[model samples]
Target: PTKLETFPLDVLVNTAAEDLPRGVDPSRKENYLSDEDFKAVFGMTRSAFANLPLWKQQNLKKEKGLF
Candidate 1:
């Protein structure tokens, strides 16, 4: 939660990821979340319901392309 708010703390979560103790390459397809692409869903409760919070794992779910 924020210093002020909660529930809609999605933006805070994502901004922290961008600041990163963990980092990502924007060039990579899986890391490519475009501006409009993200805004359509940020903080939206339905996205939470989809378990889309773990988006980085989407491609990794079936263990694709890993050598």
Candidate 2:
């Protein structure tokens, strides 16, 4: 019998949207506000804003003239 060496694989998974690469996993097309803008206007992090319902988020953006 021949012995074989197995190498472990390292995988990186990003569960948070904020941690994802920019221009890759964008929030939404209707969400025109940058992360800084979102925080400035809503006083919350982009991650928090993304947690809202899609309709609600769009409404906020429209109301704020973000889109």
Candidate 3:
């Protein structure tokens, strides 16, 4: 939000395994998605997932780990 490159939501396609990138939601960029924007789009799903018990949520395997 401070600099030139701003995009909050992005698709993570295949990248070279050697490229250990950073900045998932950097405070720099033009195409920014503010908190309001996220809430507007994912409020229901967020709440539902948040309320779910950890064990069942773990089964969903929604967590992603990338580099």
Candidate 4:
């Protein structure tokens, strides 16, 4: 379980696959959370979420591609 006080919830659990040390999958279909999911879960705007540090570090470019 991940404890996050800043988000909408008290704790966020990782129900997905454990494939790496960081664990969250970026290339998986299931890992692609929608804007609504990001808002509801993280309580943040999708535009704000796009500023996530991971995206910059990985040089990700978002399009209207399949989630």
RMSD of each: 10.5, 15.4, 7.8, 11.5
User: Ten residues in a row with the worst lDDT in model 4?
Assistant: 3-12
Better of 1 and 3 by TM-score: 3
C-alpha RMSD in Å of predicted model 2 compared with the true structure? 15.4
* lDDT per residue (tens digit) for residues 1-67 in model 3: 4542323344322333344245533212112335554355334454584577866444443332111
lDDT of 2: 0.48
TM-score, cand. 4 vs. native: 0.29
Best by lDDT: 2
The TM-score values for the models, in the order shown, are 0.19, 0.44, 0.30, 0.29
Q: For candidate 4, give the lDDT.
A: 0.39
Kindly report which residue stretches of model 1 are placed more than 4 angstroms away from their true locations once superposed. Answer: 1-31, 43-67
True-vs-predicted CA distance for residue 49, candidate 1, Å: 17
Global lDDT of each candidate: 0.35, 0.48, 0.38, 0.39
- Over the stretch 1-67, how does candidate 4's per-residue lDDT look in tens digits? 5632231111123333344225444343223455455555456565665567865423432332212
- Against the true structure, candidate 1 has what lDDT? 0.35
Better of 1 and 2 by lDDT: 2
Query: Model 1 residue 15 lDDT?
Result: 45
Top candidate (TM-score): 2
